[PDB]
Amino acid sequence: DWEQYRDRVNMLQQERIRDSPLLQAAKENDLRLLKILLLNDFQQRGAVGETALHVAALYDNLEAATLLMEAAPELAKEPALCEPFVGQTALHIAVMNQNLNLVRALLARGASVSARATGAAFRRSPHNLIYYGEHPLSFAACVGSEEIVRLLIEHGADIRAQDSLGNTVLHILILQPNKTFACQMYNLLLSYDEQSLELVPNHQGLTPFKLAGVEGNTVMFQHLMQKRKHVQWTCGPLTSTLYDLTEIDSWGEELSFLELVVSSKKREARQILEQTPVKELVSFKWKKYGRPYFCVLASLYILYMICFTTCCIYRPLKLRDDNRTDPRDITILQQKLLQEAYVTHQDNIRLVGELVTVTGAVIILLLEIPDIFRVGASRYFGQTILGGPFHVIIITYASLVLLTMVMRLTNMNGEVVPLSFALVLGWCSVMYFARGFQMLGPFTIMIQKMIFGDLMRFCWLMAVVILGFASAFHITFQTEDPNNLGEFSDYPTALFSTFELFLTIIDGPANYSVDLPFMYCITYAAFAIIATLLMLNLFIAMMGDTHWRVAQERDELWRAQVVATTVMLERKMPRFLWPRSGICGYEYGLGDRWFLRVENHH
Amino acid sequence: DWEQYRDRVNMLQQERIRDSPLLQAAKENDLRLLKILLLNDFQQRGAVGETALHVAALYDNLEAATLLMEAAPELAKEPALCEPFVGQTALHIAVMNQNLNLVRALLARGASVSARATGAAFRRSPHNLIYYGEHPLSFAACVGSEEIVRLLIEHGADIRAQDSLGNTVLHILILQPNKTFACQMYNLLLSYDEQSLELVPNHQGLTPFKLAGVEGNTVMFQHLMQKRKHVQWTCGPLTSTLYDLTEIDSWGEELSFLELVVSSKKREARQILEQTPVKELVSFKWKKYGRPYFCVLASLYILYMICFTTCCIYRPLKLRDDNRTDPRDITILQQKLLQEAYVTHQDNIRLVGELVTVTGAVIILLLEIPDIFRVGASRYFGQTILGGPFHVIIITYASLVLLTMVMRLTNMNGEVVPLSFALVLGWCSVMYFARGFQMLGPFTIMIQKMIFGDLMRFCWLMAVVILGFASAFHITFQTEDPNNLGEFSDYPTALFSTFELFLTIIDGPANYSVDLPFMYCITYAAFAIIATLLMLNLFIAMMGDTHWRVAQERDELWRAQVVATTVMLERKMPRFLWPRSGICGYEYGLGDRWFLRVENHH
Ligand SMILES: CC(C)[C@@H](C)/C=C/[C@@H](C)[C@H]1CC[C@H]2C3=CC=C4C[C@@H](O)CC[C@]4(C)[C@H]3CC[C@]12C
Ligand SMILES: CC(C)[C@@H](C)/C=C/[C@@H](C)[C@H]1CC[C@H]2C3=CC=C4C[C@@H](O)CC[C@]4(C)[C@H]3CC[C@]12C
Numbered sequence A, B: 001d002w003e004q005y006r007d008r009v010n011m012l013q014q015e016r017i018r019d020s021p022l023l024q025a026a027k028e029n030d031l032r033l034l035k036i037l038l039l040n041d042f043q044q045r046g047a048v049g050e051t052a053l054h055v056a057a058l059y060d061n062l063e064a065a066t067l068l069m070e071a072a073p074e075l076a077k078e079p080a081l082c083e084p085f086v087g088q089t090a091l092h093i094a095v096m097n098q099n100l101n102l103v104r105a106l107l108a109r110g111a112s113v114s115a116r117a118t119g120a121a122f123r124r125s126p127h128n129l130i131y132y133g134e135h136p137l138s139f140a141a142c143v144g145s146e147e148i149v150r151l152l153i154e155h156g157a158d159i160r161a162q163d164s165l166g167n168t169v170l171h172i173l174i175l176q177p178n179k180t181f182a183c184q185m186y187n188l189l190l191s192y193d194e195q196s197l198e199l200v201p202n203h204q205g206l207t208p209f210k211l212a213g214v215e216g217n218t219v220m221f222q223h224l225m226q227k228r229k230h231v232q233w234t235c236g237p238l239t240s241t242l243y244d245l246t247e248i249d250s251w252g253e254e255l256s257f258l259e260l261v262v263s264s265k266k267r268e269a270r271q272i273l274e275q276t277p278v279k280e281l282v283s284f285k286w287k288k289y290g291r292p293y294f295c296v297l298a299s300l301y302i303l304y305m306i307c308f309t310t311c312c313i314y315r316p317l318k319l320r321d322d323n324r325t326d327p328r329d330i331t332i333l334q335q336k337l338l339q340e341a342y343v344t345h346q347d348n349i350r351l352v353g354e355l356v357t358v359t360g361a362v363i364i365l366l367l368e369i370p371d372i373f374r375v376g377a378s379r380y381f382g383q384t385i386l387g388g389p390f391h392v393i394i395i396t397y398a399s400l401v402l403l404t405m406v407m408r409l410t411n412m413n414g415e416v417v418p419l420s421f422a423l424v425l426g427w428c429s430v431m432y433f434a435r436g437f438q439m440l441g442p443f444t445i446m447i448q449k450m451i452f453g454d455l456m457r458f459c460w461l462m463a464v465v466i467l468g469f470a471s472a473f474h475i476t477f478q479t480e481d482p483n484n485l486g487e488f489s490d491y492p493t494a495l496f497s498t499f500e501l502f503l504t505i506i507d508g509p510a511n512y513s514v515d516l517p518f519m520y521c522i523t524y525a526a527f528a529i530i531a532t533l534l535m536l537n538l539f540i541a542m543m544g545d546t547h548w549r550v551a552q553e554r555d556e557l558w559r560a561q562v563v564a565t566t567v568m569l570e571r572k573m574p575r576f577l578w579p580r581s582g583i584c585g586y587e588y589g590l591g592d593r594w595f596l597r598v599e600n601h602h
């Protein structure tokens, strides 16, 4: 694995230092021995192709480093050579150690300011505890050294330089934990840009501004907004400000800033939506267009489900041609064949409802399937914010409807099976529209967080308890007459009865007109204590204990689902229903830009 | 008892001081009277064989002590003589009182630095509020007096000296509450050791390092780690450190450090497992070997339970030879005798499943019973962390399986009884494997903490309520026809029905075709209010109120169960499946030691 390999690389590096007297002296800073060694091989390389001057820079030994450079000035220009450290120079190491005097001493000897630390230790990865890109300037900026950054710019470090992810030093600063020092560095780097470095995309296609949204860097986002706002006036406690919408509203682009924020896997990304500019734009969009249109789509989908339900109530059945020869058989009706299912005016009225049902199932797939491809299936079905579990069940519903149509056209028996699933999944998918309402939306997120959390854990241990007790009840009743107590008469019935008895949805079996086996009363007393008194009430207790913890995240997720709905509706609906948001600058001599005006009290 | 004896010892001591003018003067420090007394018996002894110089040292009376020593220098060498205080000298007392000048005055007169306070007041026990071992140096160290410790070392106090538990001053310092001052003292004492005192075991077989793990002394453990770590390099925000695994991983030893920590009765011991070295070693062991092998053992045990369950479903039964002459008798099948139970190919297929069932029951006892002997039964079955309640039920399961085999071989009727218990206990023991999963493990600890806590308290008061109401319902129905209401027709049925009615698992008995006794409606209304409205819902309330309090400990116990599982699997499984953990130093010129490399951000 990567851990045992990186560990071995570090062990070999330390051994090759111990085993080589020049590298050992470069580590210890014992100038005595280092003078004797250098007085009479300077190109000695440690385990990763690093020089004695890399070793001196790592241990921050300026005296050993200057003594090595006086003996062999060429060492300042040397990269390391083996996979984790490829392209790392002594300048990269000195910059990480913030040794300004060693950085001056290396630059005075022509250490390259444009050298790339290409190796696996510098790539953005869960394997690496930091990501500073590949260039000495990016290292100096992430390390927070203003003076080393100026010094590197004065030696001609290219501020536009991009690493193997396409990230510029501005993208790399958005990715750092030290957000306030990163904002101070971001102004310093923007000062040397006199087309802008803020507009350069990485290989994901993201500008620094879009990356601050995706990564949920609210401190860098509100900093980037200071160059995109204009204060129109202040009057006593009131200010009117005008915010440039260009990089937020993302007009005509296939993948907007707001879509990149609501579809981001970073939990912090949803905090960008609470910023004054994003929140007030998405609140306006939801008030004026999103809620009205989402209420119309909720209404149309409910009418479509009432239509489909009515087609199931009026489903074509006839008297069974076969005989109920078995006394346990209760089936009296049967499916009509296709050639006898469409005869009456009522069958033609149902054919219109069935054609509406099939048309809406086709429309669901035409609306759903392209968004799987845009978003990618694991992000599309996985994200709560986008509607993930509802997309699974609405596609499953449309698939079961089209399967049922194939069964109807082919005289296939058993339409009850896909129709019963489609009635449950079709109606449960009406809970998708709960996101439009503050009353229902946060509660629908609790339902989901309880299904994937507490209900999952419970059903795993509940199933183990049901297997034990169903088997004990079944073998307890194997010797007894099934007509006097039916609940455990075969093993599938014993499982189902034990499941219903666990949940207390069927009464505990009793028949006071006969002697039940004594082992039933013993087993059922233990079951009643374990399943109903303890586990069924402990479920309520652990749900109550989850509920108060999850409640703050439930509300943050609901507010983000409203924005994701707004972004989805504006993307998918006809543009004549969604007029461009904010204020057109061309009406006021401000150019082609669009704005949001926010007036606030302070 | 010990309390009334120690109290009497203290009362007699104070009386013998009051009754003896020299000891009374040694307590008061009235040098006037003490001069008159000493001018013309110095060997006067208080209630515990203590001298007037012990009394002067106890009351911290340096002037009386020096005046007593000037009259009788031999008193500095005297021990106390009666059971609680045997071997205590005036030096032990002066050291506890931190009187450096009295310690100098006693050492100047040859008070023994190697004297042992052998008496019952100095032994590690719940009877004693402190434990400083038996020697003046251990007293000075636990009292925290650096200057008295140096002074005693300068007078030749043996730093290797061991008390009646085999504890050295280092072991005794791990046992003190003042952990940060104890670490400062631990460095001072290690400085005089120039085979090491850190390697000396006590009579439990524990070194100071193992004792810090067992006692959960995380402050002393992280201090002891500072002499067992090497910083390989630091580069900007990153450091790589190498930790010596020798005393943690405990190779080839019959009882490891990690086993001593997970099996400790101290609740603080589980905090040692969260230290960087222990946590990262046990996390690696669990990731690479523990979880994969525990998932295989979970799978094999579930397949074994499905096999046993199938042998119970296909259990050999025939039509009853006897007649159902009683109209209340519902038994229609009976056990086959052994000589008719193995005839068909299906019986031979079941014999293979029954031989697998018996083989796994023998294997369970071969795996379980030796670990009872290693750990000791009360620690083995008592500890949640080790699997205690699951070890009880898995041994009970294997015992019921082997009992059932003896019943099968002997034509003994009633195999339903041990098989019904074995099906419940065998399946409920699958919850042992819940510890391997973050989803199920903490919840399985809540199940256990609720069974032993809230369910226990509830079942005690619930039983008292059922006894009252079952008796009232039984005598209410004694005069009435059992065929019209069967629930209370005899006292065992009335108990069982009242138990099912308490839990609301059977419907309240009613028969609108007859007049029930009016006393039933009155009694059942009171029962319905007390049992179902109040107590059954108050159970949910007290569980909810336990759940939020226990939730932090539940997670700490789960994280410790994962480590205990890892330690158990590595101990019990073949060593070719468990390669030695960490980094072999011999590959890198570091010797025979093994290491963990931890790289961290700061
Ligand atoms: C035998 C059939 C009828 C079985 C398989 C049916 C199961 C359905 C009812 C289950 C499967 C997944 C469940 C489910 C998935 C996720 C969510 C999202 C949550 O925010 C609201 C509830 C909701 C919508 C629930 C409702 C009930 C569903 C849809
Ligand atoms: C406890 C958790 C794990 C939940 C999810 C599981 C419930 C189990 C016990 C349920 C789920 C569906 C149930 C089920 C489905 C349908 C039938 C067909 C019927 O003719 C006999 C019973 C039988 C075979 C029952 C047995 C019990 C089952 C398998």
Ligand SMILES: CC(C)[C@@H](C)/C=C/[C@@H](C)[C@H]1CC[C@H]2C3=CC=C4C[C@@H](O)CC[C@]4(C)[C@H]3CC[C@]12C
Pocket: A522, A523, A526, A530, B389, B390, B393, B420, B421, B424, B425, B428, B429, B431, B444, B445, B447, B448, B449, B451
């Ligand atoms: C009449 C028989 C069937 C009676 C005696 C059976 C009782 C069983 C089901 C009881 C006895 C002890 C109970 C028990 C003991 C302790 C634990 C550990 C806990 O972390 C998970 C639940 C678990 C495993 C439960 C499950 C149910 C058990 C095993």
Ligand SMILES: CC(C)[C@@H](C)/C=C/[C@@H](C)[C@H]1CC[C@H]2C3=CC=C4C[C@@H](O)CC[C@]4(C)[C@H]3CC[C@]12C
Pocket: A517, A518, A521, A522, A525, A529, B459, B460, B462, B463, B466, B492, B493, B495, B496, B499
């Ligand atoms: C309320 C708590 C204390 C729980 C643990 C106790 C429940 C009691 C009421 C249960 C446990 C087992 C039950 C029980 C076992 C088996 C039988 C044999 C049956 O032919 C008559 C009823 C009888 C005798 C009932 C009576 C009620 C008992 C004794």
